[PDB]
Design an enzyme around this catalytic site. Structure first.
Site, PDB file in Angstrom:
ATOM      1  N   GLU A  33      -7.984  -2.580   0.787  1.00  0.00           N
ATOM      2  CA  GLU A  33      -8.670  -3.831   1.042  1.00  0.00           C
ATOM      3  C   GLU A  33     -10.072  -3.939   0.419  1.00  0.00           C
ATOM      4  O   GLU A  33     -10.629  -5.008   0.215  1.00  0.00           O
ATOM      5  CB  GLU A  33      -8.829  -3.997   2.567  1.00  0.00           C
ATOM      6  CG  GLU A  33      -7.532  -3.967   3.369  1.00  0.00           C
ATOM      7  CD  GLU A  33      -6.717  -5.219   3.208  1.00  0.00           C
ATOM      8  OE1 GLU A  33      -5.577  -5.342   3.597  1.00  0.00           O
ATOM      9  OE2 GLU A  33      -7.366  -6.151   2.579  1.00  0.00           O
ATOM     10  N   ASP A  69      -9.355 -14.106  -0.359  1.00  0.00           N
ATOM     11  CA  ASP A  69      -8.365 -13.091  -0.474  1.00  0.00           C
ATOM     12  C   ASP A  69      -7.328 -13.443  -1.526  1.00  0.00           C
ATOM     13  O   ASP A  69      -7.389 -14.486  -2.139  1.00  0.00           O
ATOM     14  CB  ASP A  69      -7.833 -12.768   0.916  1.00  0.00           C
ATOM     15  CG  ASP A  69      -6.689 -13.588   1.473  1.00  0.00           C
ATOM     16  OD1 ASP A  69      -6.186 -13.325   2.559  1.00  0.00           O
ATOM     17  OD2 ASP A  69      -6.235 -14.556   0.712  1.00  0.00           O
ATOM     18  N   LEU A  79      -9.674 -11.393   7.832  1.00  0.00           N
ATOM     19  CA  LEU A  79      -9.419 -12.816   7.611  1.00  0.00           C
ATOM     20  C   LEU A  79     -10.282 -13.718   8.527  1.00  0.00           C
ATOM     21  O   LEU A  79     -10.316 -13.525   9.750  1.00  0.00           O
ATOM     22  CB  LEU A  79      -7.950 -13.032   7.943  1.00  0.00           C
ATOM     23  CG  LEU A  79      -7.612 -14.508   7.857  1.00  0.00           C
ATOM     24  CD1 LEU A  79      -7.762 -14.927   6.388  1.00  0.00           C
ATOM     25  CD2 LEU A  79      -6.188 -14.725   8.361  1.00  0.00           C
ATOM     26  N   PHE A 109      -1.437  -4.725   9.393  1.00  0.00           N
ATOM     27  CA  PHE A 109      -2.785  -5.149   9.163  1.00  0.00           C
ATOM     28  C   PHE A 109      -2.849  -6.298   8.159  1.00  0.00           C
ATOM     29  O   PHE A 109      -3.587  -7.264   8.309  1.00  0.00           O
ATOM     30  CB  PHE A 109      -3.559  -3.929   8.638  1.00  0.00           C
ATOM     31  CG  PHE A 109      -5.037  -4.196   8.482  1.00  0.00           C
ATOM     32  CD1 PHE A 109      -5.556  -4.753   7.303  1.00  0.00           C
ATOM     33  CD2 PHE A 109      -5.930  -3.812   9.488  1.00  0.00           C
ATOM     34  CE1 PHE A 109      -6.932  -4.929   7.144  1.00  0.00           C
ATOM     35  CE2 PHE A 109      -7.310  -3.981   9.330  1.00  0.00           C
ATOM     36  CZ  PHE A 109      -7.799  -4.553   8.162  1.00  0.00           C
ATOM     37  N   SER A 161      15.017  -3.821   6.716  1.00  0.00           N
ATOM     38  CA  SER A 161      14.186  -2.666   6.327  1.00  0.00           C
ATOM     39  C   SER A 161      13.768  -1.839   7.547  1.00  0.00           C
ATOM     40  O   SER A 161      13.643  -0.633   7.452  1.00  0.00           O
ATOM     41  CB  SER A 161      12.906  -3.092   5.618  1.00  0.00           C
ATOM     42  OG  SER A 161      13.179  -3.831   4.458  1.00  0.00           O
ATOM     43  N   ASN A 187      14.953  -1.996  -0.472  1.00  0.00           N
ATOM     44  CA  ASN A 187      14.999  -3.249   0.301  1.00  0.00           C
ATOM     45  C   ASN A 187      13.572  -3.790   0.542  1.00  0.00           C
ATOM     46  O   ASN A 187      13.311  -4.990   0.500  1.00  0.00           O
ATOM     47  CB  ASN A 187      15.712  -3.052   1.695  1.00  0.00           C
ATOM     48  CG  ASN A 187      15.886  -4.325   2.545  1.00  0.00           C
ATOM     49  OD1 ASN A 187      15.053  -4.681   3.406  1.00  0.00           O
ATOM     50  ND2 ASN A 187      17.014  -5.007   2.335  1.00  0.00           N
TER      51      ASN A 187
END
EC number: 3.2.1.17
Length: 164
Positions: free
Chosen positions: A11, A20, A32, A104, A117, A132
């Site tokens: 990040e 972002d 965010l 996250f 998955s 996948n």
């Protein structure tokens, strides 16, 4: 390596409001602020978050304080989620880090949507789950980050990040 260092790699750290990959107002270590197009709505969320008038700008400490809250929130979210908790409980310490990372980035709900998955991870079919997971908007939109996370689930080691 740990969850904090892993996330800090993926990040980055920015002390001024930025946008972002999706175009949303964010600050610090991927926190965010709003999906709203208003810079103003962002500054408002930001001040509410820190508890002072920031001016679109925060200190390293404030960024870390937010980061701690978010990692904690991500873990609790997994543990309270009926679809997520069982996968988490089934995984080793490294792989656990990889699911926390997805949560996250994408939220509980989104990750929870990776039904097939989630099933393969639970069954420990590493190679199949990796293939996948790659068939998603997530992988196509942020391929470098997604490959790192994917490699982490595939191998159970921190190789993808030992480069970085």
């Amino acid at each position: 390596m740990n969850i904090f260092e892993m996330l800090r790699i993926d990040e980055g750290l920015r002390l001024k409001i930025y946008k972002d990959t999706e175009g949303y107002y964010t600050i610090g270590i991927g926190h965010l602020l709003t999906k709203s197009p208003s810079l103003n709505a962002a500054k408002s969320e930001l001040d509410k978050a820190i508890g002072r008038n920031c001016g679109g700008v925060i200190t390293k400490d404030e960024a870390e304080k937010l980061f701690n809250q978010d990692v904690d929130a991500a873990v609790r979210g997994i543990l309270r989620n009926a679809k997520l908790k069982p996968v988490y409980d089934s995984l080793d310490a490294v792989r656990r880090c990889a699911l926390i990372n997805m949560v996250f980035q994408m939220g509980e709900t989104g990750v929870a949507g990776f039904t097939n998955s989630l099933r393969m991870l639970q069954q420990k079919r590493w190679d199949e789950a990796a293939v996948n997971l790659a068939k998603s908007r997530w992988y196509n939109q942020t391929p470098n980050r997604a490959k790192r996370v994917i490699t982490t689930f595939r191998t159970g080691t921190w190789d993808a990040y030992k480069n970085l």
